[PDB]
Design a protein around this nucleic acid. Structure first.
Lengths: 163, 89, 136, 201, 131, 83
RNA sequence: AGUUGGUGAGGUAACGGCUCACCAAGGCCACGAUGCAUAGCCGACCUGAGAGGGUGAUCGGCCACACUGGGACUGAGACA
RNA sequence: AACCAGAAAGCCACGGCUAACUACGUGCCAGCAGCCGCGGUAAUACGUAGGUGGCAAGCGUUGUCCGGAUUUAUUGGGCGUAAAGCGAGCGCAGGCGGUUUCUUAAGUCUGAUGUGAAAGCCCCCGGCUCAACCGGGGAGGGUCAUUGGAAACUGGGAGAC
């Protein structure tokens, strides 16, 4: 839902692509932007925007992303279980990992996973490789992580009985 | 023609042997029937390990240890035990 | 498909090709036989040497030499480096590698490795082109 | 090959003492090369992990056909952080201890010492630099000819001793207390970058 | 022709859950009752009750929801579908979502969950997942 | 005598020949890759010195010793006679 | 078309169409016979998250060949 | 034990994929390239020079096999318009099957024994100044063979709806 902004943030301009539009005469080019934001503790989001010049565009996109933030429940610096998230061609697979192993995941999804404060994880893109839909599918995947406590409360019994 | 003997296992200068009861036709390091301990000539005094049960039956059923294995079996009270328990019945 | 179909159907594949067939000879002695010889090169005699023109949009006069491989198959190869010594009736080696701005040739010879002379000026990348280091 | 570089360029480039612990920082702020005194584009991700690895290496003077095997040796301890246990294992090499024992103010001088037969372990002479020094082996000094100036001079620089090294000044005897650990072991560069770099090896 | 009824049961539950209403009627039989029971202990199905007239039928099942209007049972899936039956030995017992889920196996001593299998070193045929 | 042979059961296919019938065993196997239970069959050949059994009948046999060029089984008893 | 089965004989370390005389028409095939084409087989090696895929050189086991095609003697043991 | 820093460093590359840039030279010629593509007067792409980076007694090119390929999809793909529902039926063979009682135990799980040569890969220990290497001792691999159990599932037998 609506998350405020009172914690530190981190930014990484993932990708930009000079985009044009034709009009009687020549062509006119804009520069979009694609930035995700996090605090490397378990809060992540991303945004976008476009402007005539690149610093302006990235400032816009930055200001955008800070209005979408997700939770990413973690346990011991690794996702709580296996998950699969799909959004319009974005197949993204994620599985837990061993301590101190290291993240093995493609570029665009690496930026998401890192800024969320993830230490050891594995993944594999499957299909789409657009720097946008991949990110959307990733975030959808993260939105699916269940949790021991949450399930303990949902189902009748209590945790350490759901083993 | 079963006849227990030695088998070379060392690499280039440092040999090593394991006493192995084999048929007589098969080549030096070719096949065999089974292993019976080993023995290291290097590092005098020569160190040796045996079973002392496999042998006391592979001789009883009949087999002719070659010269070197005969020495290394005499130094281990093997031949003695055989000649003791057999020439008396 | 339903699993029962693959049971009664082979479900094959699409075996790939090769990029240099003349390097896997269709044997010829004594009785003109079959191939197991996937070498890294062969040799032949230069039957003629000339220049030819590439395709658009490039523009040059590429220098080539038609050869005859020992295994009795004809091939039109390419020669690298600035200048050469190749003329008619000369034995030379054949290194496998395609060249795209010119059609019809998919092999090119190796410099200095045989009858052909190494390039005579290069000072920076003489490993290829077969040029011995200058010791003053 | 072992070493030719004048030891500034390696130090100046990556930007860590490497290992005088006090840089010779005069024009050292920027990297070597005529294109050093002006910045350039950003460093790629690949570039980052490469900086990490190359920086970890030159601190010790090892090959590449060997760094890999060292790495893979550590991959089996079955306990702890692969990068941390690697780093540990990296410190038990002989020349390291010699340097950590303060018998020479550089890994190069330590290589000379341990490489021209000048010292020993447990009494018997050993010379191959990459020997795997275990825990609790009292390295000696082979006192046949331990009267070299540099030998005693470097011992006179008793600046510090990490909390896993016990060593006397008289008989020049040292040893190893326990296994080291990250917090005290040559901060700080990184372990995750390397432990990654050997997945896209 | 209805040629696989356990799959139908699971699909009925998944449908009736996805639209979020509360009750469900299914023709009753031997094993359907048993998997219903199993699904009831684990804190998945709020309640069941058996009613029969002269034939099959009918297992009524009242679904379960979170206080904040969120679904507890989140999906369903059959495994040893006809045409290709699937078995598993004791050293292969599946384990869905690192425990947060369950799976249901037909041991030679009955129908039980998976933990109950590994605490007994048995194999059998696996019916279905759920999580 | 201390052990047995590969006693198989099976139903008769055709017994035109003298003192000789043609049992067919049958069993089911698993595919190498897939797990679908195919099924194939064998055709054995037995020796009945009195032409007892008749067509479409179930019997059980036992392997004996090379008793012809390709005839090496023995009949034991018609388990379930049919008509 | 000795093909499949039977009766009998002969023969072999040894059962048997292995070979002979007589008798009856059988046998195998869509669950791939017959034909055509390539290869010696295995312990293993290479790669792969894994299922798998590709190779059978050094070392061990087996089978088969000795200029090409036939035949047998001596012998416990060879068609050497 | 003696003597000498003394006799002992090359190779590929630097436009993006990819780590590492500027002069001079030529001017759609010479030429280069694995793919995008560079070369018609101020070329980080061609040639030399000087720097830099990667490896280092090695370094590059060719040829071949697996990978990345979820591009033969059992794990693991699809068929409205992108390649792809036969023009439609009748149907032998085959694949799959309503619900319940008793039964059997082929398929299924499980137990004991034999067996899966030695050397290999792996685990522990040990010996050459360490390392390759060598040595001892353990596991792994069957869809195998014999023998004992269980009866839910599928199959076979006698039933009832």
């Amino acid at each position: 839902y609506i998350d405020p902004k009172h914690l530190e943030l981190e930014d990484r301009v993932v990708a930009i692509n000079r985009v044009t539009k034709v009009v009687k005469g020549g062509r006119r080019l804009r520069f979009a932007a694609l930035v995700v934001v996090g605090d490397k503790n378990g809060h992540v989001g991303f945004g976008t925007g476009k402007a005539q010049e690149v610093p302006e565009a990235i400032r816009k996109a930055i200001e955008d992303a800070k209005k979408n933030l997700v939770e990413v429940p973690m346990v011991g610096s690794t996702i709580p279980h296996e998950v699969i998230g799909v959004f319009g061609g974005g197949r993204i697979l994620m599985k837990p990992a061993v301590e101190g192993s290291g993240v093995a995941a493609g570029g665009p999804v690496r930026a998401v996973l890192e800024l969320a404060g993830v230490a050891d994880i594995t993944s594999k893109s499957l299909g789409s490789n657009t720097p946008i839909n991949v990110v959307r599918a990733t975030v959808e995947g993260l939105k699916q992580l269940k949790r021991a406590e949450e399930v303990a409360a949902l189902r009748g019994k209590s945790v350490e009985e759901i083993i | 023609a079963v006849k227990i003997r030695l088998k070379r296992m060392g690499s280039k200068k440092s040999p090593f042997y394991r006493i192995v009861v084999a048929d007589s036709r098969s080549p030096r390091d070719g096949r065999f029937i089974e292993t019976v301990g080993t023995y290291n000539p290097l590092k005098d005094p020569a160190e040796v390990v045996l079973k002392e049960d496999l042998v006391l039956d592979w001789l009883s059923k009949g087999a002719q240890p070659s010269d070197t294995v005969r020495n290394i079996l005499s130094k281990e009270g093997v031949m003695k035990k055989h000649h003791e328990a057999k020439n008396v019945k | 498909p339903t699993i029962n179909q693959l049971v009664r159907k082979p479900r094959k594949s699409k075996v790939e090709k090769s990029d240099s067939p003349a390097l896997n000879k269709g044997y010829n002695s004594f009785k003109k036989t079959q191939t197991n010889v996937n070498s890294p090169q062969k040799r032949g005699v230069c039957t003629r040497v000339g220049t030819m023109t590439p395709k658009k949009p490039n523009s040059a006069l590429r220098k080539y030499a038609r050869v005859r491989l020992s295994n009795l198959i004809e091939v039109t190869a390419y020669i690298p480096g600035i200048g050469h010594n190749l003329q008619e009736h000369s034995v030379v080696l054949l290194r496998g590698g395609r060249v795209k701005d010119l059609p019809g040739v998919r092999y090119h010879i190796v410099r200095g490795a045989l009858d052909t002379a190494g390039v005579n000026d290069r000072k920076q990348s003489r490993s290829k082109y077969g040029t011995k280091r200058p010791k003053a | 090959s072992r070493y030719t570089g004048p030891s500034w360029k390696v130090s100046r480039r990556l930007g860590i003492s490497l290992s005088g612990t006090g840089k010779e920082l005069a024009r050292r702020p920027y990297k070597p090369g005529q294109h050093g005194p002006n910045s350039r584009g950003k460093v790629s991700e690949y570039g980052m992990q490469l900086t990490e690895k190359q920086k970890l290496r030159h601190m010790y003077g090892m090959n590449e056909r060997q760094f890999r095997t060292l790495f893979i040796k550590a991959s089996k301890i079955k306990e702890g952080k692969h990068g941390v246990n690697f780093m540990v294992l990296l410190e038990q090499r002989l020349d390291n201890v010699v340097y950590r024992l303060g018998l020479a103010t550089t890994r190069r001088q330590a290589r000379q010492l341990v490489n021209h037969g000048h010292i020993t372990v447990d009494g018997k002479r050993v010379d191959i630099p990459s020997y795997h020094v275990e825990v609790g082996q009292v390295i000696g000094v082979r006192e046949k000819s331990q009267n070299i100036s540099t030998i005693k001079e470097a011992v006179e620089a008793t600046v510090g001793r990490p909390a896993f090294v016990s060593f006397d000044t008289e008989k020049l005897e040292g040893s190893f207390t326990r296994l080291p650990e990250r917090d005290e072991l040559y901060p700080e560069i990184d372990e995750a970058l390397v432990v990654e770099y050997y997945n896209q090896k | 022709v209805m040629t696989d009824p356990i799959a139908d049961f699971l699909t009925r539950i998944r449908n009736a859950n996805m639209v979020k209403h509360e009750t469900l009627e299914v023709p009753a039989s031997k094993i359907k009752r048993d998997i219903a029971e199993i699904l009831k202990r684990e804190g998945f199905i709020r309640d069941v009750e058996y009613i029969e007239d002269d034939k099959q039928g009918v297992i009524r099942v009242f679904l379960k929801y979170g206080k904040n209007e969120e679904r507890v049972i989140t999906n369903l899936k059959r495994i040893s579908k006809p045409g290709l039956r699937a078995y598993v030995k004791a050293d292969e017992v599946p384990k869905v979502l690192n425990g947060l889920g369950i799976a249901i196996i037909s041991t030679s001593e009955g129908v039980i969950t998976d933990k109950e299998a590994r605490a007994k070193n048995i194999g059998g045929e696996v019916i279905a997942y759920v999580w | 005598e201390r052990n047995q042979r590969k006693v198989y059961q099976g139903r008769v296919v055709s017994d035109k020949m003298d003192k000789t019938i043609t049992v067919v065993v049958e069993t089911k196997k698993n595919h190498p890759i897939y797990g679908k239970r195919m099924k194939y069959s064998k055709k054995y050949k037995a020796h009945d010195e009195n032409n007892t059994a008749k067509v479409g009948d179930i019997v059980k046999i036992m392997e004996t010793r090379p008793l012809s060029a390709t005839k090496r089984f023995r009949l034991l008893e018609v388990v379930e006679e049919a008509v």
